[PDB]
Amino acid sequence: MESTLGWSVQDWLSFHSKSTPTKSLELLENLLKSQKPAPEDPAWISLIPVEDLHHQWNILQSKSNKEELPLYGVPIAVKDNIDYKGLPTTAACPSYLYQPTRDSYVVELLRDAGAVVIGKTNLDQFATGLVGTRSPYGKTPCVFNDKYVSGGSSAGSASVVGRGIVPLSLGTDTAGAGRVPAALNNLIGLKPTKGAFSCRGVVPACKSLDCVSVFALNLSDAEIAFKVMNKPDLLEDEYSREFPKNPISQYPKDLTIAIPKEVPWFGETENPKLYTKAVASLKNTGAKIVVVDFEPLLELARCLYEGAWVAERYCATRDFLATNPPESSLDETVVNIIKGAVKFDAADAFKFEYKRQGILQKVNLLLKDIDVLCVPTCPLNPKLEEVAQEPVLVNSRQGTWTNFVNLADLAALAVPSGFRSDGLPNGITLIGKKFSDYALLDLAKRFFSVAFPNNSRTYGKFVDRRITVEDELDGPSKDTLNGVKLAVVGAHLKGLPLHWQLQKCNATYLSSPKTSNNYKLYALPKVGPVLKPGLRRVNDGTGSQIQLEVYSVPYDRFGDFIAMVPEPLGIGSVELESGEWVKSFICEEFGYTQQGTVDITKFGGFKPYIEHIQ
Amino acid sequence: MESTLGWSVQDWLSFHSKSTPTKSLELLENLLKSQKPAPEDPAWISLIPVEDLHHQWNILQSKSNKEELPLYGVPIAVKDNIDYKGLPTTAACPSYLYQPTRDSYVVELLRDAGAVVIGKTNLDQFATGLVGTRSPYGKTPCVFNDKYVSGGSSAGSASVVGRGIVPLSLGTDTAGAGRVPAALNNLIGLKPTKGAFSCRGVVPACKSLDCVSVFALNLSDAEIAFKVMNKPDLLEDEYSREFPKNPISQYPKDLTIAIPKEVPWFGETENPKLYTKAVASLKNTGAKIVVVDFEPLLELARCLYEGAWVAERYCATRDFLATNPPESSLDETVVNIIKGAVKFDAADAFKFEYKRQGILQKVNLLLKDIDVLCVPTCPLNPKLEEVAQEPVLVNSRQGTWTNFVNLADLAALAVPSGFRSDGLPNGITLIGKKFSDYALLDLAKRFFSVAFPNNSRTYGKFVDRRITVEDELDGPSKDTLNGVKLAVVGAHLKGLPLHWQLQKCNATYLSSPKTSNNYKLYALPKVGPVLKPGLRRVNDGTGSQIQLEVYSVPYDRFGDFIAMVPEPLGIGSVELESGEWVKSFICEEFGYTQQGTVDITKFGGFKPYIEHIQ
DSSP: OOOOTTOOHHHHHHHHHTSOTTHHHHHHHHHHHTOOOTTTSTTBSOOOOHHHHHHHHHHHHHOSOGGGOTTTTEEEEEETTBOOTTSOBOTTOGGGOBOOSSOOHHHHHHHHTTEEEEEEEOOSGGGOOSSSOOOTTOOOBOTTOTTBBOOSSSHHHHHHHHTTSOSEEEEEESSSTTTHHHHHHTOEEEEOOTTSSOOTTBOOSSTTTOEEEEEESSHHHHHHHHHHHOOOOTTTOTTOOOOOSSOOOOOOTTOEEEEESOOOOTTOOSHHHHHHHHHHHHHTTTOEEEEEOOHHHHHHHHHHHHSSTHHHHHHHHHHHHHTOOOGGGSOHHHHHHHHGGGGOBHHHHHHHHHHHHHHHHHHHHHHTTOSEEEEESOSOOOBHHHHHHOTTHHHHHHTTTTTHHHHTTOEEEEEEEEEOTTSOEEEEEEEEOTTOHHHHHHHHHHHHHHHSTTTTOOBTTBTTOOOSSTTOOOOSOGGGOOEEEEEEOSTTSTTSTTTHHHHTTTOEEEEOOBBOSOEEEEEOOOOSSSOOOOEEEOOSSOOBOOBOEEEEEEGGGHHHHHTTOOTTEEEEEEEBTTSOEEEEEEEOTTGGGSTTOEEOGGGSSHHHHTTTOO | OOOOTTOOHHHHHHHHHHSOHHHHHHHHHHHHHTOOOTTTSTTEEEEOOHHHHHHHHHHHHTOTTGGGOTTTTOEEEEETTBOOTTSOBOTTOGGGOBOOSSOOHHHHHHHHTTOEEEEEEOOSGGGOOSSSOOOTTOOOEETTEEEEEOOSSSHHHHHHHHTTSSSEEEEEESSSTTTHHHHHTTOEEEEOOTTSBOOTTBOOSSTTTOEEEEEESSHHHHHHHHHHHBOOOTTTOTTOOOOOSSOOOOOOTTOEEEEESSOOOTTOSSHHHHHHHHHHHHHTTTOEEEEEOOHHHHHHHHHHHHSSTHHHHHHHHHHHHHSOOOGGGSOHHHHHHHHTTTTOBHHHHHHHHHHHHHHHHHHHHHHHTOSEEEEESOSOOOBHHHHHHOTTHHHHHHTTTTTTTTTTTOEEEEEEEEEOTTSOEEEEEEEEOTTOHHHHHHHHHHHHHHHSTTTOOOBTTBTTOOOSSTTOOOOSOGGGOOEEEEEEOSTTSTTSTTTHHHHHTTOEEEEOOBBOSOEEEEEOOOOSSSOOEEEEEOSSSOOBOOBOEEEEEEHHHHHHHHTTOOTTEEEEEEEBTTSOEEEEEEEOTTGGGSTTOEEOGGGSSHHHHHHHTO
16 A cells, blocks of 8 residues: 555655544555564564554544644664553563553653654563574564664664664663674664653663663754653652753854774774764864873773662662562563672672762763764674673673763764675774763754765665754754743844854844844944944934844853853843834944944944945 | 960961961960870871971971961871871871871861871771761760760761860761751751762761861851862762852842651750741841651752661771771771671662652652741750760761751751750751852841841850851852843942842952043933943043942843843943943933933032932
């Protein structure tokens, strides 16, 4: 009838828009029928019954402003880690199987945004691994080549978006499980700033470090997902934390990107090529690339390995393990790992925590200079064979670049970097300070325009298709501003010499209105190398309207900005064509009174004027 | 010659400034000699031998700013918990004795600022207790009466400062040891924001909760000590953290002060009479007292008794106990409290941390609303023999207000509230948010001037002496500032109706310059109930000089300020008498052109014209 495989969020929406509440249930009805559970498709642990689909779809029908839910009837998958009321939760352990009577906060949000859950996706037992092989439900393969591992622990979620069954899936990520699988499947892996997404209704692994995460095929959809799940939840998740107002949206073009001085590849020879390339590619966005000694960070990861954090896993599972459940239910590697906790007492937990904080001091000194870390997502693309032969060594290696991110409270975005000779994908992860998530998205779009020029970027398994438009970003929503509505008229307008002064203060554009009928404009005598105007409210009726640009300037930032404003300009209030009043550039009478003040009200705004003695 | 007993820091300083080095030294020697170690004075574990005094004195004399040193030649004591290189550190356990190479940073900062260490003071063993009695070296009495307990664990430090022996002492505070001994000895106990004062070179107890603290006879001395010790030490104390720029120096006159709904006294009859009177004096300062459910805070405190924090003590101390050490050198209650930690898995420790985090989510919501908490410092004035009956009960009742402050990351100040009919002191601890230390000191001063009207405040044992000038405050020094220099000319002046807007944005007064003679001042048409002026710069030589006050407004808070500036005023710039420019209130043309404007230039400033107009 049609083919859904590889449809973006947008694709799915526009279909549903020009189609009907039965014909678009048809498409979902048999997308669901085309899927297999169990051992037959190792990617899916359970699928929704056909009747559950109907039920979700009914509720989607009560919703009254349908063509506004940013995710209306978009199918999605969820690590069998994260509760959904419709299906059981397992954590890739058949005997751990419980039924939640309530959605995950995060599922609940996406359902409210109009999404349809399709089934619980397969993971490394108890989210413990970066391979994707450590599950009794089966070994999920890389979407490109069945000799190859999918990555873990979010194995099924990466696989199912990778072959485009679904445009979005959820994973979790403590130490790489939402990053490593992006690389191996040519996907986008967003590891949100910690605490931004709630973990209510997700089974605890390392609670104090855990994050729900998202796989998509493009920046576009990753953003949509992130906007929908970045929601507080304080009283029901002990590690939730509200995002601040005025989140940055875009780094400066010459932002500082650190790359590591020592890069271990462990024998790999293809992956270093793609990395080297990626860096050069950043250089040509105009980023300042600086080579940094990552020792403190690798010190921080050695904590995770030597410390008692394993005991978090133990804390979460020890009652169940005392149940002494059937052995064919447990992955021995996972169980063994988790029981390492027994050797650590309360005092050791603290001793290691002291060490964690010590290293954080160093780590915080390093990051103060730097905006973004660029890191290979992972050294290897392991074969199923290699991890069977080395079930541990391979796992550690895949943890090289991912382990420190959560312990240092950073945000990260795993993004594709091209293809090795053998036709398999790898990538880089961009790591930013907390709350930088929209800016990471933005920086990735900027890296894509260089590294896959024109529109050559590929997605998931679809090596023969091209992103045109699906890597575009909304940026943060208006909901998130809390600034001063300030109007500009001169050097601060788009393109004019001082518009940077607005960007340095993460000013956000609002609109281009005109002043009311009350105003006059003047070129003041050129002192510096920039020519500047100067508004004037004068009411002997003789005033027309001047062309304005209005920007929200974040409250905590306005000082930074007004420090740059010299005599005889200032910030007062100008009345708009709207009758509304708004903070704005004004001028001491003195300024427009000097010799060589040209009246410029004639020309409508400052724009025309500064181009005709030009 | 005269008696040193009860001398302020300033007493010490003005003697040295009017005396010869030799004569000063004599006074220090005499002082030193009049002291007796333990057991004959239970307060002192060790005194410096005369040759260390000389050695200290000499290092002082080597300095070429010696007079400009805020603590020049002031004697101080330090808890036998805190390293001074000239004496042994004990933690009040004879067999723990060791002899440090270097000073603890905090003592090193005191020394650099001129302090002379006279000796190490007695504590509850390993700083475990709120009573002062858990010590092999002796049971230190309340400086007011022999049959009463000094309070712990900083027991010595409160004795010597209470007896006017030394104007400043160092203690530590995990769950009340900097606070309870102040209430009980009529002292000021400053417990700073976590991480403000370094913990390098102090023996850990609950390392993730430890603060070094300060006792003093008066606010002024506490502030001075604070300013010297509040310095970052990130690379050598993994819990050290720098104060940000622009710390608040004063709460608004009408700040919110929370008190508890339910206030347990455990059969105390005297103490509640003091607490109620303290509450009333604070109502009398203009404060808004709110009755708050303290349940969440009390949940956090019983997190510490029930939880695995006691394992931090074990952590600090297990190697030492393994070396099966002499029985007689140990306090059995103490070692039992500590050995109680072996019950706890790493995984239990995390479980308790999850809970702690959950309670904090509730605490931080409860507190956003509030500026300060007012709490009885401690319910009881325990007698020595009451403690010998109840070596555990009394301890924990004394903990009913102290146990949540550090777990929640708060600042605190234990301050005196008067005397119970039987002649004993108690008081009030004021609890503020992180980095609020300066404003807490100022609030205490405000409290005093109502609680102890026309200079009738007592200090230490000195029931017959009167605080004249020593509770006065410098506020934070100017190098803590980072703001926009802003001139005001009108209703924002000191004493005028809109001045509150500068305090509410945490503005700091700089000075009172005039403009250059290029200025006119106008009283704008009275519209609201608040009259307003406007500056006009004019070139034509017809200007004059107008009074201003110039403030520093944190860059941080300037948006909040400008947001309250309406049409026709603005913020631009003023040239000062000095030729310097400086942000200033300015005014639209349209402002001083309106029907009803008065030229007010002849008055040389807004204030003279308001008083004339009356």
